Design a protein around this ligand. Sequence first.
Ligand SMILES: O=C(NC1CCCCC1)[C@H](C1CCCCC1)n1c(-c2ccc(CO)cc2)nc2ccccc21
Lengths: 230, 11
Amino acid sequence: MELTPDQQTLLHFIMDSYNKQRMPQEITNKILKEAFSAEENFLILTEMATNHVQVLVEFTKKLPGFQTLDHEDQIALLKGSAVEAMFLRSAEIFNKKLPSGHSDLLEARIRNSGISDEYITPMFSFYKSIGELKMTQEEYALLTAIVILSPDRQYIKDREAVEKLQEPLLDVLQKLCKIHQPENPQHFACLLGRLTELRTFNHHHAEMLMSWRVNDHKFTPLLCEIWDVQ
Amino acid sequence: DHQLLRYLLDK
Ligand SMILES: O=C(NC1CCCCC1)[C@H](C1CCCCC1)n1c(-c2ccc(CO)cc2)nc2ccccc21
């Protein structure tokens, strides 16, 4: 049941690499302190997402065996997972415990941030459903690595090479799930099930961004090639 | 094409 020394080494390596991200406190404190216009909030998201993509590329290239992959499959994996990794990270941040009434204010601030009503509902249903999993930082880190190293992404030339890389991470996560939550033996299945919901956000993402109640939808050149926006 | 992502990956 317990982790092998290789798995323990793998877990800690993924964990350190994952912690190079912007602190959940830095994001929440920024939007909780002041109420912003849709224009300022669009600009906050665009800055947040550019930093996120940058740190995501660095996290991804530290994933074991990632640098041994074909360079075209490398791009495909990063483009394929970037939106999902972003919503999983927002879901992580959203569900961090804050003082009384703070999580309620954060939610109300995202709700009136500037996004269309139609996208708020599936986004908050996904966040609340991730919270019901009571995920550890380790679980968030591994699931992000699993999302990145998805062999069933579009335009992947060598699925098997990606499969061989994702399999040790799935093994670790499963060992963790059966350790922390023996009470819920279906916890691992529930985690993998959320991944199929993340995929839906990817499909309607460009529409989500253009639907923001701003006059100009200006993105950074990096977000432009990652999100396929103009 | 995606030269920014390519640049970040190849550094
Ligand atoms: O900053 C943010 N996200 C970043 C993204 C990169 C990784 C870290 C989080 C934003 C905005 C919140 C409203 C004010 C402006 C930023 N956000 C969203 C969110 C809202 C809309 C979309 C698509 O339109 C995507 C994500 N969910 C959040 C849940 C918790 C805390 C921030 C959250």
